[PDB]
Every structure is written in C-alpha cells, then in structure tokens.
Design a protein around this nucleic acid. Structure first.
Ligand code: MG
Ligand code: MG
Ligand code: MG
Ligand code: MG
Ligand code: MG
Ligand code: MG
Ligand code: MG
Ligand code: MG
Ligand code: MG
Ligand code: ZN
Lengths: 69, 60, 94, 244, 91, 114
RNA sequence: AGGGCGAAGCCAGAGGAAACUCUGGUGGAGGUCCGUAGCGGUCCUGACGUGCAAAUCGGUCGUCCGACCUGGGUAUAGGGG
RNA sequence: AGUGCGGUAACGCGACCGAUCCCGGAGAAGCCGGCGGGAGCCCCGGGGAGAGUUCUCUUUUCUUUGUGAAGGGCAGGGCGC
RNA sequence: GCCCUUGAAAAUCCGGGGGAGAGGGUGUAAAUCUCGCGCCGGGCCGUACCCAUAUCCGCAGCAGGUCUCCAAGGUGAACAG
C-alpha cells in the first residue's frame, strides 16, 4: 500500500480509469480515505473531520464511495 | 512459592557452602567478572579524561 | 654520509615527514629537498619524482628502507617520504 | 589366493587420485613466436595453495598476442615470487628469478626448476617443493645441455627446452615431524587412498606373499627379481644392495 | 620462563609424542607462527597463510616463501648466485 | 510456550531452509522463511579487500529488478572498482606514458647523435 | 550440554649494572581430563535362552572437537571387490 | 548549442543512447574460539478483563493482555570510505 | 586461533572499459540496463494420513532398527537426575 500527503494527489489518483472503491474509514481522530487501484491501495490520512466531510463531496462521477462500518 | 524463595536468595540465603554444586567459576565466570571490571574502570578513566580531570599522559 | 647531515636538519631546520604532507609542501613550492626511502611504493615515488620536476626541487633517494629513514629522522616511527623545507645550518642541500 | 593390495591400485576405483579442489595443472607457458624469439611479459596476479601439493602456485596472466584477450597460467612458484611482480619469459628473457628461459641461454651453475624434460612439454623435472636442477654444461653443436637433477642423476637435455630460474617455493616442509596419526590422515586425504598401510607380515598368506606363519616373519628373502609376476614383486624390488 | 621452564609453544602437546620430537617441533612451531616484516611497507605483518605462502595484511603482498620461514637459506643463496651470474653474462 | 513447525516439506536445517520468528496479527508466532544475505561487489583491482560503496548488496538475480543507480556509482570504473585504485590507475597510466615519451626523446637524440 | 587443567602471545609490578629473572593478572591452546546427547559395547561369564529379539534387556562400562558421528548421491562384483 | 545534473571528496539525485569485443563481480564457501547488536522465550514491577482460594491469612494466586509481506521514515549496528 | 587439511562446480544475474553505430534538425527525434503509472499471461506432475513401544523394515499392532525442526517453570554447573 501507499500513503499520500496531498488532498489533491489522492483526488488525482481517484480520478484514474483503473480505480474503483474509495472506502472511507472514520477512525475517530483520523478519517482515512482508502482508494483501491490496479496495483496499489492508496490511503490518505485527513486529521480534520469537516475537511473530510468536504472531501466526501469532491469524489467525481459515481465511484463506489463505500463508507466503512 | 518460588518467588518467595527467590526473595530469600536476594537477602543472602540458601546460598552457603552446602547449597553449591558448581565450581565458583561456573557460578560466576572469572572472565565475565574481569570483563565487567575493565569495562567499568576504563569507562571511569575516559570519563575523567573527557572532563579535563586527567591529562592524556596520566590517562594512558 | 646523509644520516649525519639529516641529524642536524631535524634538530635545527624545518622539515616535514610523510607523503600527504610533503606533496603539500612541494605543491606550495617551499620544499627544497625530498628524501625517499628505497622501499617506497613505485607509483608513489614516480608521482613524487614528477612533482619535484615540475617544482624544480631536489630528490634524494635514501640508501635505506623506510624504517631506516625514520630511525634516521630520530623518530621511533617509520617514514618513507620526507621533505626538507629549511635546513637549519646543515649542508644537506649542497 | 587373493589379488593383493597393490595389484588393486592399478584398477583405479578406490585408489584413484582425489582432485576436486585441485586448482589445475601447474604447467609452463606454451611456446610461440614471442617466447621463441623475444620475451613475453606477464604479471603474477596471485599466489595460491593447491591441495595435495607442497609447492604453491602462481596465477600469472599475460596478453595473448593475436586476440585481444588476457590469457593466464599456473606456474609453480619460484621462491621469492610475489604478487604485482612481472614475470618475463622467452629466449631474450633477463636472467633473474621467476623468469622462464631456455636452458641453453642461461649460464653454467644456474639454478632452475619446472624444467622441460623435452622441448615444449610445459615443465616436467624438479617441481616438487624445495627442489631444483642445476644447468651443468652446454654443447653448442648438438644444441644440447647437461643438467643435474635433484635425484643426483646428470641427464642430457635439448638446449631449447625451458625452465624457470630459481628453486621451488615451500622448501623444508619435511623438517617438521608429523606427530599425530591424524596429521598423517589429513595429508593423504587431500591426495589419494594410500594411508594407513598394513604390513604384509600382518596379513594372512592369501592376500600377501609374506603372510601367514605362527610368528610374524617374512619366511622368504624380502629382496626380489624384477622379472617377477605382479603378486610376488613385494618387499625390495631388484635391490642392488639392501642394508644400512 | 613465567609459566613453563622449557616447553613454551609445544606445551600444547602435553606429554605426547616424545621429548625429541617436541623439541624438534618447537623450532618450526615458533618460526611458522612468527609475524615477520613486510619488506614492501615495513610493517611487521608478514604472516604465513598456508605452506610456502606468506601474506602481508597491510601490503596485501602475497609472497611465495618457505614452508616454515618467509625465507629459506637455500632460496637466499640461490638468489645471490643468480644475481652474480646475471652480471657476469651481461656486463 | 508456543513451539512451532517448519512451513515447507524441507525438514532439514540447511542454507536453503533458514527462518525467522514473527508475530502475526492473529497473535501466533509463525516461521517466516528468510532470504539469503547479498554481498556488495568486491573491486576489480583485487588487492583492496574491502567491498564497494554505493551499491545495494543483494542476491545477484535481484539486480535484474534494481535501477541502474543502485547498481553502480557515478565515476569512471563505477561500481566495478574502488576509487583509490582508479586514482592510482589514472596517475600511474599518466606517469608511465610520460616516461615512455622521455625514453622516446632519449632514443631520438641518440639517433641524431649517431 | 555443563565443568576441569590452563600452552603460546599480552599487561603491570619488583629485582637485576646487563643478560634477563621473579610475582600477580590476562589469554584460551589440546587426536587434553571429567561428563550429557551421539557413537560404541568391558564386566555381571546378571536377565532372557520353544525369547520381546534367528543376538534382545538391565545395571555397569569405553568414548564424547576428531584418524568424531551421521542422511542422501556416487564408485568398486565373485578367484572378483 | 543541447545522448541528464549535484557534490573538494567518499559519493548523490526517478530516468539518463549504444553492438561484436574485452575485464570484473555476484552465484561461491572449512572448522573452532571470544566479544557485541537484534529478535523469540523466560524473569521482575505495576495497570486492566475473567479465575481460583478465602476456617485464619493473602491490595491474592492463575490465565490473558496482538499486528504478515511489500513500501516509506527513523533508531541501532558496521566500514580496510 | 588451527592446518605437510586451505575447505565445490555450473546455470543464472549484474557492473565496468571500450566506442562500431543510431537520432532530429530548433520542435521534435531516436533513446530509456526506465522512472512512475496502465493491459495480458504463467501450462505440466506431486499435495490425503502415519513417520513409530499400532500405518515403515525386521514372517506379526515384535522391548530391535530407522535422517531432521520446535523445545516452558522449579532445583541445579547443567539439554544431568
Ligand atoms: Mg592374523
Ligand atoms: Mg601366496
Ligand atoms: Mg535446495
Ligand atoms: Mg548509488
Ligand atoms: Mg549370561
Ligand atoms: Mg526358561
Ligand atoms: Mg510384552
Ligand atoms: Mg500434509
Ligand atoms: Mg512424532
Ligand atoms: Zn582498490
């Protein structure tokens, strides 16, 4: 797997053709964003909750966004 | 029951001549006892030197 | 003999022992002479020999091996290359 | 009765030589225009140990003078050879140590080893450990040279055939006592199955001609013909004189 | 003679092998384990690696020498003769 | 104490069958089989006993995978030969050629003299 | 396994005019000793002797860093190995 | 003009043309000792969760108390650079 | 440290030296021992269990024999009992 550091970078990785499920783990104090691809499972740690809630909307065409519980 | 007895062995007990089967060197190896000492005294010496307590030549 | 004239140089004159330091002395153009032990590595010697040629400096091949030369500098260590910057009052330099 | 130990060593099988870890043959360089007419220069890349051999060897690398290619050899080390030394060889080779040149060139009293018994053989006489030959004397016509071998014999030789100047390295090996049987065992194991050797006197009289008896004695004379069928030729073969 | 009067190196062998042999071994047994001087750098590091092959650890100069000594006498005497004859031939 | 078994049909403890202990997320100590220890390449000089710098000492059939930069170093004779032996080769090869020129000059003067 | 003995080398101190010698350490040699697993197989002329066994069992023993033990592969075949 | 650039240097940076030919390395090395680092296990002192004991004593005794490979970072080792 | 013991080959994989060639003509090329990502594939045979005081060999569920890995607490020099 691969961790990502820029909210833009994860948005670009999510926008690929190969991608699919962009599941979202609210850990408390963390809120990850795991986006599977062909090769790698990209994750992105977004410490803020409101910023995670904002990003939630910014995934594009109708991807899975299979929120995790 | 063991733990209790180990606490006795700490106090210096069940440890006299008649409860030793091994040689002294087996019980505490002379080499190890030496190694400790050098590693102490040498450490004391180079701490002294590196505080300007003792000079190069004394140290040596 | 050279051992006698050196003795005086080491006592009174300025000098430098060893390859890393003497090549720096020649390269400055201060070194007036360069003594080489006989056992010195062949590449090293020829390198030094060329550095003297460029700096118009004397090169004296010592009769002895680097242990003898260091003994001959009055040091308990062994020296293969030695430069003589300023002789004190000797006629090591002719 | 039996085929005796001795007759059996000829069939090889168990008594063949052990040669896994042996580093190669210990030849001389093969002759060619350069060797024949001038001198080819090579360098001693390393000095080596060769199991079952008291002499150390020397990887000596030359340059093939036809293909761009660094050919290499295994000389037996002349004593005083060392690495990063050059090893010149040929007719016009300089008469210093570890320097293979024809016996005809080199002067009288010149000590050599790995000396070619017949021209072009690649080094056959005197290649043991502390051993060498001495060039006695030359006959300019007939192109022949007389050489004194380590056995004492004074063999005649073609002046063309080469030798390395100097003696073989690792001399005086046999001054050290072995002491331990173990130390013997370990010697011959890197060579061949020839060690703990049982005296024919010990054996029953089917496996050796000295065998049998109620007392460990020989019973017949231990000297013997060499017009002797293999199976009797045992003890002292063709022994000219026998005692101390 | 701190620990032994007269065995030294060959005290390892204990009683075994006989007095003469052990005396005979002491000469070699010493020389072979001796650290000699590398006539190449001049450090005291010439150490027998295996029979007839001595290696300087610093110089990295492996040197075909004797079985129990960096030099045999034979080798030395042979060296000088060859040098003499070399000079006699060329002039 | 949790004792354990080998994970493969190779029973014997060999060069091939080397292991290590690992605690899993399942909380059971399990053997993992270990990869052999790769060596850095030694120098082309052959005297310098020390192995080369700036090269990933890894089992040779891996090198395949690795990038070029891991496998070598930016120098002439890079990742084949230690620096010291290059800068001695360099000045050797130079100084030799200067003397060859000097002997050529002494030869040419001798021809002109004779 | 674990112990014993403590060879070269090394340190200090003391003596010695020198040669070098003593004292205390350190060091860890060896087909070295004890002794386990291992390998073996001394004695009881023990057990057993239509056996557990067409050679086994028990104690007692030898050896246990080396001419050590040992799997697989491979070689040598009958007046032959 | 342009088959990449940085560092005094060890060397570095995500890539950095290239044949036959040549050289080198890795694969690729005995046994034994000593010392050191890293883990697994043991041990000790406590936190919890469940236990057993409780005639008297026992802040009890017992169990259990996790993070694969592959990446990235950083200790910690080593260097005959 | 030990050796009159010096302790495997090869398949495979890489590095370097060389510089025969190739590339496009001022926005692109050939080039990536290619950097990052993307796509497709990996056939064949073995895979149960026993592995030993009852799955093996000793005519047997025979006190025999038969190569390895893992290896807790106490006592104790100790994988001794
Ligand atoms: Mg008999
Ligand atoms: Mg007969
Ligand atoms: Mg295998
Ligand atoms: Mg690099
Ligand atoms: Mg009986
Ligand atoms: Mg009966
Ligand atoms: Mg029964
Ligand atoms: Mg199975
Ligand atoms: Mg079982
Ligand atoms: Zn080098």
């Amino acid at each position: 797997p691969r961790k990502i550091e820029e909210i833009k970078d994860f948005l670009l990785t999510a926008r690929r053709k190969d991608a699919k499920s962009v599941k979202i783990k609210k850990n408390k104090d963390n809120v990850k964003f795991k986006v599977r691809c062909s090769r790698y499972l990209y994750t992105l740690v977004i410490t803020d909750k409101e910023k995670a809630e904002k990003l939630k909307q910014s995934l594009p065409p109708g991807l899975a966004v299979k929120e995790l519980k | 029951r063991c733990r209790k007895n180990t606490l006795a062995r700490r106090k210096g007990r069940h440890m006299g001549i008649g409860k030793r089967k091994g040689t002294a060197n087996a019980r505490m190896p002379e080499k190890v006892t030496w190694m400790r000492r050098m590693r102490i005294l040498r450490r004391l010496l180079r701490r002294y030197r590196e505080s300007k307590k003792i000079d190069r030549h004394m140290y040596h | 003999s050279i051992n006698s004239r050196l003795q005086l140089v080491m006592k009174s004159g300025k000098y430098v022992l060893g390859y890393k330091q003497t090549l720096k002395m020649i390269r400055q153009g201060k070194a007036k002479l360069v003594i080489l032990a006989n056992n010195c590595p062949a590449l090293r010697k020829s390198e030094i020999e060329y550095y003297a040629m460029l700096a118009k400096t004397g090169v004296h091949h010592y009769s002895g091996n680097n242990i003898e030369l260091g003994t001959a500098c009055g040091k308990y260590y062994r020296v293969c290359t030695l430069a003589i910057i300023d002789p004190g009052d000797s006629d090591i330099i002719r | 009765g039996r085929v005796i130990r001795g007759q059996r060593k000829g069939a090889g099988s168990v008594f063949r030589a052990h040669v896994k870890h042996r580093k190669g043959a210990a030849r001389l360089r093969a002759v060619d225009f350069a060797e024949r007419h001038g001198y080819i220069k090579g360098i001693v890349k390393d000095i080596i140990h060769d199991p079952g051999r008291g002499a150390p060897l020397a990887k000596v690398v030359f340059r093939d003078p036809y293909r761009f290619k660094k050919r290499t050899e295994l000389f037996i080390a002349a004593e005083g050879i060392h690495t990063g030394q050059f090893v010149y060889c040929g007719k016009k080779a300089q008469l210093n140590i570890g320097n293979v040149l024809p016996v005809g060139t080199m002067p009288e009293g010149t000590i050599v080893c790995c000396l070619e018994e017949k021209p072009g053989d690649r080094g056959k006489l005197a290649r043991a450990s502390g051993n060498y030959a001495t060039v006695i004397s030359h006959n300019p016509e007939t192109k022949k040279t007389r050489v004194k071998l380590p056995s004492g014999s004074k063999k005649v030789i073609s002046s063309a055939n080469r030798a390395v100047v100097g003696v073989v390295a690792g001399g005086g090996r046999i001054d050290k006592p072995i002491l331990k049987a173990g130390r013997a065992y370990h010697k011959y194991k890197a060579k061949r199955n020839c060690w703990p050797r049982v005296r024919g006197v010990a054996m029953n009289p089917v496996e050796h001609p000295f065998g049998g008896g109620n007392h460990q004695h020989i019973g017949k004379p231990s000297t013997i013909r060499r017009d002797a069928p293999a199976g009797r030729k045992v003890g002292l073969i063709a022994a000219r004189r026998t005692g101390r | 003679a701190k620990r032994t009067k007269k065995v030294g190196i060959v005290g390892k062998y204990g009683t075994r092998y006989g007095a003469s042999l052990r005396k005979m071994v002491k000469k070699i047994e010493i020389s072979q384990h001796a650290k000699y001087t590398c006539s190449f750098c001049g450090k005291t590091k010439m150490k027998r690696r295996a029979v007839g092959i001595w290696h300087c650890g610093s110089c990295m100069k492996t040197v075909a020498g004797g079985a129990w000594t960096y030099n045999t006498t034979s080798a030395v005497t042979v060296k000088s003769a060859i040098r003499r004859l070399k000079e006699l031939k060329d002039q | 104490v949790q004792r354990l078994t080998y994970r493969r049909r190779l029973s014997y403890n060999t060069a091939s069958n080397k292991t290590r202990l690992s605690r899993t997320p399942g909380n059971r100590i399990v053997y993992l089989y270990t990869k052999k220890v790769g060596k850095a390449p030694k120098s082309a000089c052959g005297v310098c006993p020390g192995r080369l710098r700036g090269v990933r000492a890894v089992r040779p059939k891996v090198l395949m995978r690795l990038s070029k930069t891991k496998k070598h170093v930016s120098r002439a004779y890079g990742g084949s030969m230690c620096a010291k032996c290059v800068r001695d080769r360099i000045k050797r090869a130079f100084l030799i050629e200067e003397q060859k020129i000097v002997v050529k000059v002494l030869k040419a003067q001798a021809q002109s003299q004779k």
